[PDB]
Design a protein around this ligand. Structure first.
Ligand SMILES: NC(=O)c1ccc[n+]([C@@H]2O[C@H](COP(=O)([O-])OP(=O)(O)OC[C@H]3O[C@@H](n4cnc5c(N)ncnc54)[C@H](O)[C@@H]3O)[C@@H](O)[C@H]2O)c1
Ligand SMILES: NC(=O)c1ccc[n+]([C@@H]2O[C@H](COP(=O)([O-])OP(=O)(O)OC[C@H]3O[C@@H](n4cnc5c(N)ncnc54)[C@H](O)[C@@H]3O)[C@@H](O)[C@H]2O)c1
Ligand SMILES: COc1cc(/C=C/c2ccc(O)cc2)cc(OC)c1
Ligand SMILES: COc1cc(/C=C/c2ccc(O)cc2)cc(OC)c1
Lengths: 363, 363
């Protein structure tokens, strides 16, 4: 900047307004198959090489497609998402957006999180939900929804998100693969780092889906039995799981009895009154010394400008947009709810991965 | 210590995919009138005071509205866009998203760029274009546009952007206000920092609109005659201006004769062959020792990870999305075009403001 500091203020303002460009560009680079080619490459590749390898079809305008991809990747290079090298061309190049010199690109480490295959410890499924147009369009109606005290999503589509999925099979698939992708990674990391399944006879997984989380947990605690508690329609679609009883119900009526209850990414959908109802049912269903295991992000007590804190408040806003009064909570807030619900002044927190903690409350 | 690394990398991937949240939250805080309250406030104010000052209307759910705005502001505070202080509540609170303690917010300096009339000059009209739904939607169709070698805009709406604006008066207004806003800031900055208007008898402003740029330029260089040259339909609606001749025409036919020709944000709309045609007309229009003055961003010849270079590549992708073959160019590329068009190996560059340079080529 011309110093000024005024100039840098101005450019900073523009950066803030333009923060959508990176996500949308990475999505394009993924969809085009360019990202997968960067992830399987032995060396830096030009846009021309990356297009020829990603795309089988004959392209109507092959030179234009190549210079556009170059421009995509050059921008991602300025944000450190890919590495760029520039070399002089012996002649002239028709597939670069510069005609002295060719740029070649390689994946930065972070790009492994966008892989379509591998062992599928990627966040791509969750990424195509985050950048799904149907979900993104809600973010344009925040203002009106705040004024009405409503969820932006419901102001955009006229019903709650979970109801809307019922009318939209493709979005419903994107949503379920994202949730399953996330649950897969957290469950593996939970089994690596968390010790609070040891000694449990019966684990109730509230929102257990097809019961895969209980299966994977039981793979490690063979003597443990599980209750996959989920809505009657979700229970129905579930194949039998050795050691696991599938039970249908609403967590608002009742939760099955067990030594521990697992709530993964449940309470953040709901406001305090609903969360105190879920936790009171957790209470009545446990014996003394039984616990709730809450798998959730935890927002700091004050808005720190760190990578973790930003991530957390960003998930908060995603809950705002999605559900309105669903929210991300501090540890203190999780504690207050657990205490309102009758749980004791005995709190454990174990950091798992990607801002998810396992918080444990004891009856 | 490679768990830390895997975790950091994963969070960085999520940050990259979630970078739309900031722009969209800023838009909400502005549209709600909260940003202007921040900009005129004496001290830090709570979301509840900010909503009470910004909203005249009566609200159906005022507590919910307040806690939602708190959540928006807390997130912007984690991005350093606003300042936040936290104080214990010695009473009874449900208008922050925590009951123990109230957050109060103040504007960071960067927020003056988001003024409606809050604090001064601002890039709000430009940002309302940037975050306009119609323009943003195009970013979702980059993948297919690349494959067909087309502008994402054309692939989303079935025709080019200038065509489409003719059929959408509200968006045509948004587009024109953004360009007037940016032209106004840059003209003022040009008169502070640029010295290439001195000694000119006749300056031709190609695309001059209603002729404000020459008026303000004449406001400083009294003996300068302007020619405000633009499309016949734009010249129709222009009130007279002392010392400025309004001439309708197209720049691809002819340019009026002059000592200098000003091209502000014209060449970046067009591919090389179109830019060389514009500049060859600029050539023929000038006497020897006359100048073309180009007002443009200038990309670095390599993708540096600085605020400035990211800004410039961000504008290049905006041109890609909007026009396809519109592009930002390096200094060498601007030079190659000018020399193709007959200009001397005699090149000047003066940095203006918000990434804009005034480059001058001589005959
Ligand atoms: N604060 C609140 O908004 C609040 C508070 C208390 C109760 N509620 C409940 O919300 C209901 C909304 O009506 P409805 O007819 O759409 O709901 P419903 O008849 O399906 O009630 C069951 C509820 O369980 C939820 N649920 C989500 N995951 C679950 C899981 N794994 N297992 C069990 N239940 C799960 C569903 O979203 C659903 O809202 C009200 O009837 C009320 O009982 C809301
Ligand atoms: N790449 C090219 O140069 C290209 C493509 C097709 C045709 N052509 C030829 O070049 C000309 C371009 O076609 P057209 O008849 O649509 O021309 P035009 O006068 O409509 O110019 C096209 C665009 O340039 C801009 N423009 C032109 N002069 C301007 C001025 N004085 N101020 C501000 N904006 C201005 C406007 O946005 C306009 O939509 C024709 O004479 C045609 O034969 C050129
Ligand atoms: C004709 O000049 C233009 C400039 C612009 C600049 C937009 C822009 C976007 C983001 C920024 O940070 C700065 C400018 C856009 C245009 O068509 C939509 C045309
Ligand atoms: C029920 O749990 C949900 C989790 C989420 C998680 C989304 C997300 C967004 C960005 C990230 O960086 C991580 C997760 C979204 C939901 O509705 C859209 C529901």
């Amino acid at each position: 900047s011309a110093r000024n500091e005024e100039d840098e203020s101005c450019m900073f303002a523009l950066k803030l307004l333009g923060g959508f460009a990176v996500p949308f560009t990475i999505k394009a680079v993924i969809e085009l198959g360019v990202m997968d080619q960067l992830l399987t490459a032995e060396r830096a590749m030009s846009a021309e090489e990356l297009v020829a390898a990603a795309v089988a079809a004959q392209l109507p305008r092959p030179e234009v497609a190549c210079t556009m991809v170059d421009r995509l990747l050059r921008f991602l290079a300025s944000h450190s998402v890919v590495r760029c090298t520039t070399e002089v061309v012996v002649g002239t190049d028709d597939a670069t957006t510069t005609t002295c010199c060719r740029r070649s690109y390689a994946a930065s480490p972070v790009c492994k999180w966008f892989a379509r295959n591998g062992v599928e410890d990627s966040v791509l499924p969750l990424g195509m939900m985050i950048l799904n147009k149907t979900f993104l369009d809600s973010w344009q109606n925040i203002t009106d929804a705040v004024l009405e005290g409503a969820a932006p999503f419901e102001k955009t589509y006229g019903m709650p998100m979970f109801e809307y999925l019922s009318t939209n099979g493709p979005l419903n698939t994107v949503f379920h693969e994202a949730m399953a992708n996330h649950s897969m990674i957290i469950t593996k990391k939970l089994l690596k780092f968390f010790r609070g399944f040891e000694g449990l006879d019966v684990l109730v997984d509230v929102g257990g889906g097809n019961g895969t989380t209980l299966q994977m947990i039981r793979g490690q605690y063979k003597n443990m039995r599980g209750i996959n508690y989920d809505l009657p329609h979700v229970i129905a679609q579930a194949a039998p799981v050795e050691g696991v009883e599938h039970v249908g119900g609403s967590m608002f009526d009742n939760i099955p009895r067990g030594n521990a209850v697992l709530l993964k990414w449940i309470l953040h959908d709901w406001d305090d009154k609903a969360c105190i109802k879920i936790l009171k049912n957790c209470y009545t269903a446990l014996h003394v010394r039984g616990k709730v295991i809450v798998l959730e992000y935890v927002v700091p007590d004050e808005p720190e400008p760190t990578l973790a804190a930003q991530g957390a408040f960003e998930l908060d806003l995603t809950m705002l947009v999605t559900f309105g009064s669903g929210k991300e909570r501090t540890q203190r807030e999780f504690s207050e709810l657990a205490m309102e619900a009758g749980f004791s002044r005995e709190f454990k927190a174990t950091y798992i991965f990607a801002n998810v903690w396992a918080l444990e409350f004891t009856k």
